[PDB]
Design an enzyme around this catalytic site. Structure first.
Site, PDB file in Angstrom:
ATOM      1  N   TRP A  61       0.775  -1.367   0.283  1.00  0.00           N
ATOM      2  CA  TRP A  61      -0.018   0.030  -0.049  1.00  0.00           C
ATOM      3  C   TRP A  61       0.816   1.157   0.120  1.00  0.00           C
ATOM      4  O   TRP A  61       1.707   1.384  -0.826  1.00  0.00           O
ATOM      5  CB  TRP A  61      -0.936   0.108   1.285  1.00  0.00           C
ATOM      6  CG  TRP A  61      -1.713  -1.178   1.234  1.00  0.00           C
ATOM      7  CD1 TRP A  61      -2.881  -1.363   0.545  1.00  0.00           C
ATOM      8  CD2 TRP A  61      -1.695  -2.263   2.169  1.00  0.00           C
ATOM      9  NE1 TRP A  61      -3.294  -2.611   0.539  1.00  0.00           N
ATOM     10  CE2 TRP A  61      -3.068  -3.072   1.860  1.00  0.00           C
ATOM     11  CE3 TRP A  61      -0.986  -2.720   3.265  1.00  0.00           C
ATOM     12  CZ2 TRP A  61      -3.081  -4.374   2.596  1.00  0.00           C
ATOM     13  CZ3 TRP A  61      -1.237  -3.631   4.241  1.00  0.00           C
ATOM     14  CH2 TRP A  61      -2.539  -4.524   3.637  1.00  0.00           C
ATOM     15  N   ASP A  62       0.455   2.234   1.057  1.00  0.00           N
ATOM     16  CA  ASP A  62       1.395   3.467   1.241  1.00  0.00           C
ATOM     17  C   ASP A  62       2.802   3.408   1.045  1.00  0.00           C
ATOM     18  O   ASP A  62       3.323   2.410   1.814  1.00  0.00           O
ATOM     19  CB  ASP A  62       0.807   4.156   2.428  1.00  0.00           C
ATOM     20  CG  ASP A  62      -0.677   4.381   2.407  1.00  0.00           C
ATOM     21  OD1 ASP A  62      -1.140   5.409   2.931  1.00  0.00           O
ATOM     22  OD2 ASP A  62      -1.273   3.261   2.502  1.00  0.00           O
ATOM     23  N   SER A 140       2.001   5.091   7.998  1.00  0.00           N
ATOM     24  CA  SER A 140       2.943   5.761   7.332  1.00  0.00           C
ATOM     25  C   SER A 140       3.644   7.008   7.774  1.00  0.00           C
ATOM     26  O   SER A 140       3.395   7.531   8.936  1.00  0.00           O
ATOM     27  CB  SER A 140       1.724   6.644   5.851  1.00  0.00           C
ATOM     28  OG  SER A 140       1.804   5.224   4.959  1.00  0.00           O
ATOM     29  N   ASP A 218     -16.572  10.775  14.980  1.00  0.00           N
ATOM     30  CA  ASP A 218     -15.345  11.731  14.741  1.00  0.00           C
ATOM     31  C   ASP A 218     -14.097  10.978  14.446  1.00  0.00           C
ATOM     32  O   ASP A 218     -14.150   9.707  14.457  1.00  0.00           O
ATOM     33  CB  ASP A 218     -15.045  12.219  16.385  1.00  0.00           C
ATOM     34  CG  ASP A 218     -14.165  13.297  16.322  1.00  0.00           C
ATOM     35  OD1 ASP A 218     -14.047  13.933  15.213  1.00  0.00           O
ATOM     36  OD2 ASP A 218     -13.484  13.726  17.075  1.00  0.00           O
ATOM     37  N   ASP A 224       1.294  10.226   9.531  1.00  0.00           N
ATOM     38  CA  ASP A 224       2.073  10.418   8.203  1.00  0.00           C
ATOM     39  C   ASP A 224       3.187  11.640   8.475  1.00  0.00           C
ATOM     40  O   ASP A 224       2.919  12.780   7.737  1.00  0.00           O
ATOM     41  CB  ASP A 224       1.149  10.966   7.162  1.00  0.00           C
ATOM     42  CG  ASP A 224      -0.002   9.935   6.757  1.00  0.00           C
ATOM     43  OD1 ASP A 224       0.169   8.734   7.464  1.00  0.00           O
ATOM     44  OD2 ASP A 224      -0.787  10.059   5.830  1.00  0.00           O
ATOM     45  N   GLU A 319      -4.979  13.620   4.393  1.00  0.00           N
ATOM     46  CA  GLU A 319      -3.792  12.555   4.233  1.00  0.00           C
ATOM     47  C   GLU A 319      -2.673  12.823   3.650  1.00  0.00           C
ATOM     48  O   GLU A 319      -2.484  13.699   2.652  1.00  0.00           O
ATOM     49  CB  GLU A 319      -4.424  11.310   4.182  1.00  0.00           C
ATOM     50  CG  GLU A 319      -5.577  10.797   4.861  1.00  0.00           C
ATOM     51  CD  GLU A 319      -6.136   9.531   4.337  1.00  0.00           C
ATOM     52  OE1 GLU A 319      -6.552   9.322   3.456  1.00  0.00           O
ATOM     53  OE2 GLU A 319      -6.381   8.445   5.125  1.00  0.00           O
TER      54      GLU A 319
HETATM   55 CA   LIG Z   1     -12.633  15.825  14.551  1.00  0.00          CA
END
Ligand SMILES: [Ca+2]
Length: 448
Positions: A61-62, A140, A218, A224, A319
């Site tokens: 993936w990432d 990540s 939330d 990252d 992200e």
């Molecule tokens: Ca929030």
């Protein structure tokens, strides 16, 4: 009245710019290039052991390359190095950081060799750390080649056992060459936590719990981390959420004109629709931020700084924080899911890379291409050539940046594993960006 205007001394991804994207996006200037489906292959070296012990093909993936301090792709003993999250889907909730390496001359996806996992399952329990022993997943970050020529990793310590606690973590990755064409991971040192939120500038996991985050929908993020250098100082730029004092989540945020932009009629109409609708809670909880912290020379926390930009009311999830200097200006990038956004015209299939330009590292960030839109990917998650985690890689010369991403590759036939997507080029000119047409590169290519 309840209406107010609070910028908090920081930039904002405004609703006015976001509502303009749908009518702007349908253009090859922004569209993620169509990839040739027949030539898509798995990473051949992406072999690994599942939680059972059997050797299997991994979903990759990432991914992020080992970078020079200015952002350019590093050269380690004649090798380019990529760190990548990988694991077994039959153990759905598990990502581990793997080290992939390739000789500078080689170009193909078959040329990427695998050194294995960066960390052993034992590594997190070794040092004296307040968080590492609670780690459930490795998430990540970034990799930098130091002036001392050491492989310095930054990644996210994720704790599923601690309500999704995310801590910015660092480690020195000790390398060796057993032969003339092999890199080996020896082990790790200087393995320690740096930052997990302060409460005032960046949201902690405790505040997430305390407001009833598990039910309200939330999204707590502190991940990252991206290493960068400016004027002798060392920084990490990372995905976060605002704290109590720099524009906190809640109902009042919907009254803050700074998050809306545009004229008063736009503010009044957009706010009214937001307060009435089923997106009220979603927009209220939406307080994403791209944070910045300064580090000491030993890579410990020096200073917790105010965020570079926020996405209050727009989304709770911005992200893959990316930042680099080009032509004397500072460029900031973020990936965003349309499914997380609260904007009219943007839907579940829309995936974006957004971009912002400033004259200084911590100055005012203005949207690229007027709205902030840089890349648009709207392919269905079931498509073979679906791409995600788009990352702009700066180059030594030229105005073009290399875009890397991972391709989910979930076809009915072989090949069928999440792999390196074909890279492509994006031209940067002032506050304007454009995809370079018909310049599709090799899968996981870093430089041109
Ligand atoms: Ca929030």
């Amino acid at each position: 009245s309840k209406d107010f205007n609070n910028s908090y001394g920081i930039s904002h991804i405004t609703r006015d710019n976001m509502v303009k994207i749908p009518q702007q996006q349908n253009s090859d200037q922004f569209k993620v290039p169509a990839f040739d489906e027949s030539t898509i292959k798995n990473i051949a070296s992406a072999k690994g052991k599942n939680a059972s012990g059997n050797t299997i093909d991994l979903d990759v993936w990432d991914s992020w390359p080992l970078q020079n301090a200015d952002g350019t792709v590093a050269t380690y003993h004649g090798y380019q190095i990529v760190f990548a999250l990988a694991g077994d889907p039959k153990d759905s909730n598990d990502t581990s950081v793997y080290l992939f390496y390739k000789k500078a001359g080689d170009k193909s996806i078959d040329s990427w060799k695998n050194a294995g996992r960066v960390f052993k399952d034992s590594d997190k329990f070794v040092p004296n750390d307040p968080h590492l022993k609670n780690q459930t997943q490795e998430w990540s970050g970034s990799g930098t080649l130091t002036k001392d020529g050491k492989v310095r990793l930054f990644y996210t310590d994720y704790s599923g056992k601690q309500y999704g606690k995310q801590t910015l973590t660092t480690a020195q990755v000790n390398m060796s060459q057993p032969n003339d064409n092999t890199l080996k991971v020896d082990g790790v040192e200087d393995y320690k936590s740096i930052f997990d939120g302060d409460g005032k500038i960046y949201q902690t996991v405790q505040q997430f719990i305390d407001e009833g985050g598990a039910d309200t929908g939330d999204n707590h993020t502190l991940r990252d981390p991206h290493y960068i250098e400016d004027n002798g100082h060392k920084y990490l730029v990372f995905e976060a959420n605002t704290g109590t004092e720099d524009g906190y989540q809640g109902e009042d945020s919907l009254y803050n004109r700074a998050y809306y932009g545009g004229n008063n009629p736009f503010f009044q109409s957009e706010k009214k629709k937001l307060l009435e609708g089923s997106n009220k809670e979603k927009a209220s909880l939406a307080n994403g931020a791209l944070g910045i912290i300064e580090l000491n020379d030993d890579y410990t926390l020096k200073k917790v700084m105010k965020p570079l930009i926020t996405s209050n009311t727009v989304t709770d999830e911005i992200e893959r924080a990316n930042i680099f200097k080009k032509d004397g200006k500072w460029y900031l990038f973020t990936d965003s899911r349309g499914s997380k956004m609260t904007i009219d015209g943007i839907g579940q299939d829309d995936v974006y890379m957004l971009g912002y330009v400033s004259n200084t590292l911590t100055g005012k960030y203005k949207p690229l291409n007027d709205t902030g839109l840089v890349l648009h990917m709207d392919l269905d998650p079931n498509d073979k050539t679906f791409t995600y985690s788009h990352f702009a890689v700066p180059q030594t010369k030229g105005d073009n940046v290399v875009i890397t991403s991972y391709m989910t590759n979930r076809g009915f036939y072989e090949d069928n594993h999440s792999t390196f997507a074909p890279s492509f080029l994006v031209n940067i000119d002032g506050s304007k960006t454009s995809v370079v047409k018909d310049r599709v590169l090799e899968q996981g290519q870093l430089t041109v």
